[PDB]
């Protein structure tokens, strides 16, 4: 036995394309469509819950995922991809960061930890590139309200707005027309909830539609009282309730 | 094309063309069988007599792990041994934190664990051998037929190499003229009789029949060879039946 | 070894380091040279455990002479200080630790000062108008306290110099054999061959 | 053809090539003959020279007091396989005070080949060898190929032309394996042998080697004026 | 087995080149341009941000000039995941030297240890090379202002000006016309940009294509001073140079 | 790790990646070593393709390994600067060691080594790099020159060229090169090298850089307007 | 035990005692205490016995590898050094060796260095080592010169190893002789201290204190 | 592509047999086994005449008792040699006396198969190694990199071997004094040598017991090629 691919298996071509990551960019584009819009005091990130199966309970895949208490993310591709990025992302932000610091770290600096993760699959021996764009919303003090695209290659780039997958090409026109830099967080959420209908064939409800924000602090999830100090998470994924009264004011 | 030039590679179909292949040199083995009676387990083999140089009941085919299971194959022998070698790590590591000797099932298990491991990288070539074996613990008698790909079932007869149709059909004969059961003293018989029938395959050169057993009462739970007056009552059991 | 002495003065360092070597019972040797040349206008005296002293001394001197070839260009004393301090701070928590205490007197040719940084084993490390190590300090720092001026020359700096061996002589229970002194300036390193 | 790059592929008839290869450097190897009686074990070796002024490849070695062996094919392998079991004879006699017996030196051997064709970056040995010893069963013939397979015989013969030395052995079964008590009438059985494989060439004083173990005989090679005797 | 599925990343030619260092460099040819300058009394480094958004925020955003440490800055062509990985090993080298000789890090041993780890990755290990170029503005006492550049090779060059990733054939020879040796900081940033605006791909070179910096010892007296423009500083300086 | 036997026999006995990594040193920028009676001069073509380089920083072509030996070479140059920096390694070693610096000829058959070792070493290709070593044995007034190649074979040269249109300067060196009487002086030796590199330049501005080493580690480049004065005065006994 | 050496006009003379203890009990009085290195070089064997002469018979392995390799006779200077390198690797585990590395070459002249267990090398011109130094010293001190004959500066050699011979419980049996010049050592025999203490007591009228 | 160990299907290592084909493309060496001595000579073959030739060492001092000549990928050699003479030194150490020629020829032989995916590629050069002991006198080996080593009464390395082979076939006798073999090896090698043979283009050497390895001197090469001249110009 033992690992005996220890050469690269992603390399350049004569064009100096490197095919295994363009390849996993075209992964994404076949992926369901997942957006983020960032507000004044917030940040959105929905997609569409594509159910395999009417017998399998999509309320137990969860493609919206919290990696800290600030800080959430979803994405367009290969769902096991993520997940297993999900896992790697959650501890690097403990053993690269709050072990060392006492405090989660900063958006931009998680978002560079799983960037590296990504970018290592693409260069390492005997392994593919993540078949997977994720798109990562969070808050932290210094910086504030943020949000970030990681593509297969490593490469993360902040956005005001974006999409990603199946119909991101239309849905960035339509987020274009709609962002100002003076957008509430209500507003963000409704111009998701429109520009995410575009892309959804079938049912389009709580129960289909995954979305969660990153807003003020919710110190009614924190689990525990007596600290003034914390006042609780600011990820919080919305119910099915919350989605459809939004439905109704559509 | 060229998914059967590299092990663990699926094939279009969802085969490994490699482990079919491995089956391809274990047809072309010489003729081992099982045969699973009331407390206990026989097992029997055909030996090609190549040359006249080979000295008579030396190269023992049969292989013993611990004290209570036999094991015998067809295809490449040295695949065999090594996969005996293997057994015998197993039975003894099992035997020294557990200290009961290994179960047959449990045993089963870890040889199938081993052969199916051969089958997940392209760096190891899958095992060229079909394994016959079992023996006596606490539950009875167990008798296994263990295949290339890993996989392997429990048996009442089993039959593996060139000759193993012929075997085979003489070995479902044996099921259904005997529900209540076979002995151990007729298994040896029958086993016998059933390497010479399957000889037909391989009846250019002539052959040496080689038998074991393990029998509750006929040899205490313990994997013994036939010898002697017992080995040869059954070739002459043997030889009456095919004329 | 036993005593090392420094002093930096106006435009040059000087090194001061006793010549006897002594195996137990016996003096094997009253003429040793307790130094080496790490660059041009670095110099590097030494004193601590038999073996360790010179194994530390020669190993630093060639890492100093391999970044001088290298870069083609000599290390300020300061860099060269630092260097050897993390060398002994990293040695302290080893297996079996480097047994030895250094002056380092260099002069720096792009400020035009002489600098004098004295370093135990443990990788403590100071920049001092005039130093010492082990019992040395103890004899010879009274006097220097007193008569050292930052404007001496070279000549008053040996004179100074002079007055502390001697008091050490006087004083001191152990034959150290007199000093060999070698002067650092603007010029390099040269050995008083009269002392 | 698509399936001979490595040991560690089977072909679509389930057959391993890089082995089968391994096996063919035997057949271009010189002969050598093995055969025993109840009482000694003898084998006889043809050497071959490179030219006239080089010397002749020895063939035979020797691996414990009672045993040893003969080689035909790649001799580096020999060297390797032979030195692997003077330490298994070796181990045997230091931890358990005992000498190793022949057959169990067969296992080893046919074991430490196997190992050779199941992995990767690996090759086979590529040589064939014969193995004669004394051990508490009296005496013993094995021959081993780099397949593995290792098999005790009254006697045999690998290398080119082998098969005439096999044939004459398989007449003569019946009457060297009585030659009991007589080293030398089972030398020249073995020397009758190995001539039923020479053409062309003959026996000469620098080209035989032969080598005996038996009942109160250690393993000794005889090369030089000591087969003149024989020739 | 394995070897199957090998490239083969470190091997020549028959001509005696590196295929992927070759591939790696035409790669490299498609990325943003970026520029540096070196004027008597500091640097300038100028590059294209790659067909932007109007909804990217720009203001947070950075994938062509980065920090190593207080006096030396890069300016990147290519992979930008793959640059960020070298860039961290640079910032650590740097700290490390600093912590050693308690001395800041000359600029060239700076570039020197980058360039060795790409080498590396051509000659043993069988990994593809980064595909990355990387423009090294700094200041030591030393040497005072440089200009190096590194390319997927791991060979190193000084420059009086210079540029990397797409049309460098055009871009240098408009640099070798206007440069002169007594140019200033001021009029380096103007045939930076200048440079740029012809060179480039797009319609019209603006601010929100940019990203731009400077390393003036315009800081108050002996000491240096690194400055990465801000969007609307970006803005100004195009009106001032007349380009916008 | 990567094991990957890259440098291999050929049926016809080549190892390719040995001879490809020649092909290599074909490529790479002139390098010339000429020895004198008492001294060796390494000369060094620079090419004109690249202006606005900033001469000051530019790693330079000839490089010291102790104070008394020096290397140029003529390939890949990312790959001179490993050997380069494990030959100023081991003579520091060797003067730890033996009390005593690297003759001109131990300093070559290491480097020599470590090509040779990159020839037959899983996971690794050979050096695109041939190297000219030079200089003086300590306290010894013989000059020194050796040469060095992929393969790691190694030898001495009263003469040497290496890199591009070394066939055309050796062709020349071949002829004006007398064994019974070297150039008796450095200007005689650096005149030679600099008529010898003017073979094949071009312009002899910033394209010709020379090196002058003597005994007792007395080594020294010449500027722009030293080399100059010899362009000068070989074009004005031309044209005659 | 009782070693010297020391450099003269005519190259270097190593005297060494041959008495071996266990405690009180002499285990021998035949002792080899001078290490034949090579033909050129020499090495004397103070305090353990195995560790002198285990690794001084491979310092003359790895002169014969550089020679091997260099051409070149190795240089008294390496030679010593790569012994004190080798001891220093095992500082601490308990090697015990105090050995003075003697030697003529053309680039240094004759040349001796005092090689030592804590690692210690030092060059220089008399080197004494064991039980018995202290008085070979004194016998060297009082009457060393450079200009010493050849024939002089044996017998000085000799008549130091008595003197701690007969003072030093621990030192006697014999003296062994050598001469190191530039072509090699030779040797100048092996002489029973019991005759010699008679001999040198009548002819030179020293050791007034005992009786003969 | 194909395995660095593997088998033709004529039973051969593809590798050990196109390392052959490198080893023909080599210089010339020759050895030549007497009972006053054995001689072993060499074609420098300088690839210019700018290369001093006297630092083209294919002849090397393994120990005093046994010297080598080499043939091929001499690059290849140095780690051979460096094996060897640590070996002659160490079994020395081991055992305070000589090693046997074969003894030593083995131990570098046993360098040769240990190649894979160890090192990458067998060597591409071949070595004669003569020397003397007490047990079997003089004596000259052939060592290979298949592994494979031959005693030899005379042999031929190298481009000009199997016309060298085939002349010291009919050339050597059991009684041949050490002048005569000195004088077949120059011989032998003014035949099959491109140049015209000097003594700056060949090099000669020897091992007695007396007198251990030697490597001749250019002027003492010189005068046995004057002798060789008047010798062949006297019939």
Same mark, same amino acid.
């Given at each position: 036995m033992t690992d005996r691919y220890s050469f690269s298996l992603t390399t350049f071509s004569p064009s100096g394309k490197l095919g295994q990551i363009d390849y996993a960019l075209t992964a994404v584009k076949q992926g369901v469509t997942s957006l983020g819009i960032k507000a004044t005091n917030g940040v959105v990130i929905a997609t569409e819950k594509k159910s395999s199966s009417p017998l399998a309970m999509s309320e137990t895949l969860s493609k919206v995922s919290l990696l800290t208490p600030d800080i959430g993310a979803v994405y367009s591709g290969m769902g096991p991809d993520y997940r297993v990025l999900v896992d790697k992302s959650r501890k690097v932000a403990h053993t690269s960061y709050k072990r060392i610091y006492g405090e989660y770290p900063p958006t931009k600096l998680l978002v560079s930890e799983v960037a590296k993760?990504?970018?290592?699959?693409?260069?390492?021996?005997?392994?593919?590139?993540?078949?997977?764009?994720?798109?990562?919303?969070?808050?932290?003090?210094?910086?504030?309200?943020?949000?970030?695209?990681?593509?297969?290659?490593?490469?993360?780039?902040?956005?005001?707005?974006?999409?990603?997958?199946?119909?991101?090409?239309?849905?960035?026109?339509?987020?274009?027309?709609?962002?100002?830099?003076?957008?509430?967080l209500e507003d963000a959420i409704h111009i998701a909830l429109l520009t995410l209908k575009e892309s959804v064939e079938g049912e389009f409800n709580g129960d289909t539609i995954e979305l969660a924000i990153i807003g003020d602090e919710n110190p009614d999830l924190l689990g525990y009282t007596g600290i003034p100090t914390d006042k609780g998470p600011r990820f919080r994924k919305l119910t099915s309730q919350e989605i459809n009264d939004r439905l109704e004011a559509l | 094309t060229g998914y059967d030039l590299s092990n663990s590679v699926f094939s279009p179909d969802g085969r490994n063309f490699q482990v079919e292949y491995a089956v391809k040199a274990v047809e072309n083995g010489t003729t081992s069988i099982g045969i699973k009676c009331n407390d206990g387990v026989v097992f029997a083999v055909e030996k090609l007599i190549t040359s006249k140089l080979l000295v008579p009941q030396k190269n023992v085919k049969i292989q013993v792990v611990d004290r209570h299971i036999g094991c015998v194959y067809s295809g490449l022998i040295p695949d065999g041994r090594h996969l005996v070698n293997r057994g015998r790590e197993e039975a003894?590591?099992?035997?020294?934190?557990?200290?009961?000797?290994?179960?047959?099932?449990?045993?089963?298990?870890?040889?199938?664990?081993?052969?199916?491991?051969?089958?997940?990288?392209?760096?190891?070539?899958?095992?060229?051998?079909?394994?016959?074996?079992?023996?006596?613990?606490?539950?009875?008698?167990?008798?296994?037929?263990?295949?290339?790909?890993?996989?392997?079932?429990?048996?009442?007869?089993?039959?593996?190499?060139?000759?193993?149709?012929?075997?085979?059909?003489?070995?479902?004969?044996?099921?259904?003229?005997?529900?209540?059961?076979?002995?151990?003293?007729?298994?040896?018989?029958?086993?016998?009789?059933?390497?010479?029938?399957?000889?037909?395959?391989?009846?250019?050169?002539?052959?040496?029949?080689?038998?074991?057993?393990?029998?509750?009462?006929?040899?205490?739970?313990?994997?013994?060879?036939?010898?002697?007056?017992?080995?040869?009552?059954?070739?002459?059991?043997?030889?009456?039946?095919?004329? | 070894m036993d005593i090392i002495l420094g002093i930096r003065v106006q435009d040059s360092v000087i090194l001061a380091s006793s010549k006897a070597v002594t195996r137990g019972i016996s003096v094997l040797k009253d003429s040793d040279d307790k130094t080496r040349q790490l660059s041009p206008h670095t110099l590097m005296s030494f004193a601590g455990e038999a073996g360790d002293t010179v194994q530390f001394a020669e190993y630093i001197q060639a890492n100093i002479q391999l970044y001088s070839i290298r870069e083609? /260009?000599?290390?300020?004393?300061?860099?060269?200080?630092?260097?050897?301090?993390?060398?002994?701070?990293?040695?302290?928590?080893?297996?079996?630790? /480097?047994?030895?205490?250094?002056?380092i007197g260099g002069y720096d040719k792009k400020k035009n000062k002489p600098e004098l940084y004295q370093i135990d084993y443990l990788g403590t490390k100071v920049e001092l108008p005039y130093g010492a190590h082990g019992y040395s300090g103890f004899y010879t720092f009274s006097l220097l306290d007193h008569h050292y001026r930052p404007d001496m020359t070279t000549e008053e700096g040996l004179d100074l110099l002079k007055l502390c061996v001697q008091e050490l002589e006087k004083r001191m229970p152990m034959d150290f054999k007199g000093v060999i002194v070698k002067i650092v300036d603007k010029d390099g390193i040269r050995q008083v061959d009269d002392f | 053809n698509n399936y001979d790059g490595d040991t560690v592929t089977f072909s679509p008839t389930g057959r391993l090539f890089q082995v089968e290869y391994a096996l063919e450097a035997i057949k271009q190897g010189s002969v050598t003959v093995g055969l025993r009686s109840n009482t000694h074990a003898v084998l006889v070796a043809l050497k071959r020279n490179a030219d006239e002024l080089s010397s002749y490849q020895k063939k035979i070695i020797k691996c414990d007091e009672?045993?040893?062996?003969?080689?035909?094919?790649?001799?580096?392998?020999?060297?390797?396989?032979?030195?692997?079991?003077?330490?298994?004879?070796?181990?045997?006699?230091?931890?358990?005070?005992?000498?190793?017996?022949?057959?169990?030196?067969?296992?080893?051997?046919?074991?430490? &080949?196997?190992?050779?064709?199941? @992995?990767?970056?690996?090759?086979?040995?590529?040589?064939?060898?014969?193995?004669?010893?004394?051990?508490?069963?009296?005496?013993?013939?094995?021959?081993?190929?780099?397949?593995?397979?290792? !098999?005790?015989?009254?006697?045999?013969?690998?290398?080119?032309?082998?098969?005439?030395?096999? !044939?004459?052995?398989?007449?003569?079964?019946? !009457?060297?394996?009585?030659?009991?008590?007589?080293?030398?009438?089972?030398?020249?059985?073995?020397?009758?042998?190995?001539?039923? @494989?020479?053409?062309?060439? @003959?026996?000469?004083?620098?080209?035989? @080697?032969?080598?005996?173990?038996?009942?109160?005989?250690?393993? !000794?090679?005889?090369?030089?004026? &000591?087969?003149?005797?024989?020739? | 087995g394995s070897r199957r599925y090998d490239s083969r990343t470190t091997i020549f030619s028959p001509e005696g080149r590196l295929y992927q260092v070759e591939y790696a460099l035409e790669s490299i040819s498609h990325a943003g341009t970026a520029i540096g300058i070196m004027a008597s009394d500091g640097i300038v480094l100028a590059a294209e941000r790659k067909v932007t958004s109007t909804l990217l925020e720009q203001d947070t955003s950075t994938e062509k000039l980065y920090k190593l440490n207080d006096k030396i800055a890069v300016a990147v062509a290519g992979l930008t995941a793959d640059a960020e990985i070298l860039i961290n090993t640079a910032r650590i080298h740097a700290q490390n030297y600093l912590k050693t000789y308690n001395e800041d890090i000359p600029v060239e041993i700076l570039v020197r240890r980058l360039s060795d780890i790409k080498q590396g990755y051509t000659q043993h290990g069988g990994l593809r090379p980064f595909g990355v170029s990387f423009i090294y503005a700094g200041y030591d006492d030393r040497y005072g202002y440089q200009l190096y550049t590194s390319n997927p090779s791991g060979n190193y060059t000084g420059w009086k000006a210079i540029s990397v990733g797409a049309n460098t054939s055009a871009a240098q020879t408009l640099l070798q016309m206007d440069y002169k040796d007594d140019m200033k900081v001021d009029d380096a940033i103007e045939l930076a940009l200048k440079t740029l605006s012809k060179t480039t791909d797009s319609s019209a070179l603006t601010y929100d294509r940019l990203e731009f910096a400077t390393i003036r010892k315009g800081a108050n007296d002996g000491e240096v001073y690194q400055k990465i423009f801000k969007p609307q500083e970006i803005k100004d300086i195009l009106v001032k140079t007349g380009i916008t | 790790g990567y094991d990957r036997a890259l440098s291999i026999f050929s049926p016809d006995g080549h190892i390719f990646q040995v001879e490809y990594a020649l092909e290599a040193v074909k490529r790479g920028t002139c390098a010339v070593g000429?020895?004198?009676?008492?001294?060796?001069?390494?000369?060094?073509?620079?090419?004109?393709?690249?202006?606005?380089?900033?001469?000051?920083?530019?790693?330079?072509?000839?490089?010291?390994?102790?104070?008394?030996?020096?290397?140029?070479?003529?390939?890949?140059?990312?790959?001179?600067?490993?050997?380069?920096?494990?030959?100023?390694?081991?003579?520091?070693?060797?003067?730890?060691?033996?009390?005593?610096?690297?003759?001109?000829?131990?300093?070559?058959?290491?480097?020599?080594?470590?090509?040779?070792?990159?020839?037959?070493?899983?996971?690794?290709?050979?050096?695109?790099?041939?190297?000219?070593?030079?200089?003086?044995?300590?306290?010894?007034?013989?000059?020194?020159?050796?040469?060095?190649?992929?393969?790691?074979?190694?030898?001495?040269?009263?003469?040497?060229?290496?890199?591009?249109?070394?066939?055309?300067?050796?062709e020349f060196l071949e002829k004006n090169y007398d064994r019974k009487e070297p150039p008796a002086t450095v200007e005689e030796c650096v005149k030679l090298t600099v008529r010898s590199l003017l073979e094949v330049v071009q312009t002899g501005a910033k394209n010709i850089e020379i090196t002058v080493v003597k005994p007792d580690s007395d080594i020294v480049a010449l500027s722009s307007e030293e080399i100059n004065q010899y362009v000068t005065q070989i074009e004005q006994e031309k044209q005659e | 035990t009782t070693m010297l050496a020391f450099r003269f006009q005519g190259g270097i003379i190593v005297a060494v005692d041959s008495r071996a203890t266990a405690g009180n009990w002499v285990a021998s009085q035949t002792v080899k205490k001078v290490i034949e290195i090579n033909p050129f070089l020499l090495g004397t064997m103070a305090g353990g016995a195995a560790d002198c002469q285990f690794w001084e018979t491979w310092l003359g392995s790895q002169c014969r590898l550089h020679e091997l390799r260099e051409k070149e006779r190795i240089s008294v200077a390496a030679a010593s050094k790569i012994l004190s390198n080798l001891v220093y690797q095992y500082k601490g585990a308990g090697l015990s060796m105090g050995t003075m590395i003697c030697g003529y070459t053309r680039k240094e002249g004759p040349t001796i260095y005092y090689v030592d267990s804590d690692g210690t090398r030092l060059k220089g011109d008399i080197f004494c080592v064991g039980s018995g130094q202290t008085f070979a010293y004194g016998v060297l001190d009082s009457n060393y010169k450079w200009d010493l004959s050849v024939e002089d500066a044996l017998y000085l050699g000799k008549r130091s190893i008595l003197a701690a011979a007969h003072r030093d419980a621990y030192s006697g049996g014999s003296v062994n002789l050598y001469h190191v010049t530039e072509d090699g050592w030779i040797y100048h025999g092996n002489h029973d201290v019991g005759e010699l203490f008679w001999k040198v007591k009548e002819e030179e009228g020293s050791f007034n204190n005992v009786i003969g | 592509?194909? %395995?660095?160990?593997?088998?033709?299907?004529?039973?051969?290592?593809?590798?050990?047999?196109?390392?052959?084909?490198?080893?023909?493309?080599?210089?010339?060496?020759?050895?030549?086994?007497?009972?006053?001595?054995?001689?072993?000579?060499?074609?420098?073959?300088?690839?210019?005449?700018?290369?001093?030739?006297?630092?083209?060492?294919?002849?090397?001092?393994?120990?005093?008792?046994?010297?080598?000549?080499?043939? %091929?990928?001499?690059?290849?050699?140095?780690?051979?040699?460096?094996?060897?003479?640590?070996?002659?030194?160490?079994?020395?150490?081991?055992?305070?006396?000589?090693?046997?020629?074969?003894?030593?020829?083995?131990?570098?032989?046993?360098?040769?198969?240990?190649? %894979?995916?160890?090192?990458?590629?067998?060597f591409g050069v071949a070595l004669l190694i003569a020397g003397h002991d007490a047990d079997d006198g003089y004596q000259l080996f052939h060592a290979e990199p298949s592994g494979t080593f031959y005693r030899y009464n005379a042999k031929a390395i190298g481009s000009g071997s199997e016309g060298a082979q085939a002349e010291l076939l009919n050339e050597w006798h059991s009684s041949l004094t050490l002048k005569e073999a000195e004088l077949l090896v120059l011989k032998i090698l003014k035949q099959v040598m491109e140049e015209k043979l000097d003594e700056n283009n060949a090099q000669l050497s020897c091992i007695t017991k007396q007198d251990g390895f030697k490597i001749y001197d250019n002027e003492k090469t010189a005068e046995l090629i004057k002798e060789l001249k008047e010798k062949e110009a006297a019939e």
């Open positions: 993760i990504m970018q290592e699959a693409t260069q390492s021996g005997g392994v593919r590139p993540f078949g997977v764009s994720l798109l990562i919303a969070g808050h932290d003090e210094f910086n504030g309200f943020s949000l970030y695209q990681v593509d297969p290659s490593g490469s993360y780039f902040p956005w005001k707005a974006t999409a990603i997958g199946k119909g991101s090409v239309a849905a960035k026109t339509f987020l274009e027309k709609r962002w100002n830099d003076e957008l509430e | 003894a590591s099992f035997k020294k934190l557990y200290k009961t000797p290994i179960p047959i099932p449990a045993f089963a298990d870890r040889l199938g664990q081993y052969v199916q491991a051969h089958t997940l990288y392209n760096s190891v070539r899958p095992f060229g051998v079909s394994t016959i074996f079992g023996g006596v613990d606490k539950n009875g008698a167990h008798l296994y037929m263990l295949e290339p790909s890993g996989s392997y079932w429990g048996y009442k007869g089993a039959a593996t190499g060139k000759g193993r149709q012929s075997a085979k059909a003489e070995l479902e004969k044996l099921v259904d003229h005997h529900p209540e059961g076979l002995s151990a003293r007729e298994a040896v018989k029958q086993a016998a009789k059933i390497i010479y029938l399957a000889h037909e395959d391989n009846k250019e050169k002539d052959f040496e029949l080689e038998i074991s057993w393990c029998s509750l009462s006929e040899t205490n739970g313990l994997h013994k060879f036939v010898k002697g007056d017992l080995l040869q009552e059954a070739i002459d059991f043997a030889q009456k039946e095919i004329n | 083609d /260009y000599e290390l300020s004393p300061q860099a060269v200080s630092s260097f050897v301090r993390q060398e002994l701070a990293k040695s302290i928590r080893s297996r079996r630790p /480097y047994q030895v205490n250094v002056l | 009672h045993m040893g062996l003969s080689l035909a094919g790649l001799a580096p392998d020999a060297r390797v396989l032979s030195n692997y079991l003077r330490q298994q004879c070796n181990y045997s006699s230091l931890v358990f005070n005992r000498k190793l017996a022949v057959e169990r030196a067969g296992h080893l051997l046919c074991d430490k &080949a196997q190992k050779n064709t199941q @992995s990767y970056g690996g090759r086979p040995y590529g040589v064939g060898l014969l193995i004669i010893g004394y051990d508490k069963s009296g005496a013993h013939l094995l021959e081993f190929q780099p397949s593995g397979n290792v !098999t005790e015989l009254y006697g045999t013969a690998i290398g080119a032309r082998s098969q005439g030395a096999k !044939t004459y052995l398989e007449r003569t079964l019946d !009457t060297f394996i009585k030659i009991d008590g007589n080293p030398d009438e089972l030398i020249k059985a073995g020397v009758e042998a190995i001539s039923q @494989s020479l053409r062309d060439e @003959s026996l000469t004083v620098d080209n035989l @080697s032969i080598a005996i173990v038996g009942k109160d005989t250690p393993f !000794t090679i005889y090369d030089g004026e &000591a087969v003149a005797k024989y020739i | - | 000429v020895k004198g009676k008492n001294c060796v001069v390494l000369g060094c073509e620079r090419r004109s393709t690249l202006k606005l380089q900033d001469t000051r920083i530019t790693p330079s072509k000839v490089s010291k390994i102790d104070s008394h030996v020096v290397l140029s070479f003529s390939g890949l140059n990312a790959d001179s600067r490993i050997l380069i920096e494990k030959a100023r390694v081991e003579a520091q070693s060797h003067r730890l060691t033996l009390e005593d610096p690297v003759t001109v000829e131990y300093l070559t058959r290491y480097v020599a080594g470590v090509q040779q070792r990159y020839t037959q070493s899983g996971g690794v290709r050979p050096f695109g790099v041939s190297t000219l070593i030079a200089g003086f044995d300590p306290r010894d007034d013989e000059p020194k020159l050796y040469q060095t190649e992929p393969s790691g074979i190694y030898s001495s040269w009263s003469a040497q060229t290496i890199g591009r249109n070394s066939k055309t300067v050796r | - | 592509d194909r %395995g660095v160990s593997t088998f033709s299907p004529e039973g051969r290592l593809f590798q050990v047999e196109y390392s052959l084909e490198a080893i023909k493309l080599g210089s010339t060496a020759i050895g030549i086994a007497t009972k006053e001595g054995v001689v072993l000579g060499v074609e420098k073959r300088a690839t210019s005449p700018l290369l001093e030739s006297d630092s083209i060492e294919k002849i090397v001092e393994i120990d005093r008792h046994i010297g080598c000549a080499m043939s %091929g990928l001499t690059a290849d050699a140095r780690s051979m040699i460096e094996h060897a003479r640590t070996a002659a030194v160490t079994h020395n150490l081991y055992y305070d006396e000589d090693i046997n020629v074969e003894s030593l020829t083995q131990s570098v032989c046993d360098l040769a198969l240990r190649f %894979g995916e160890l090192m990458s590629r067998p």
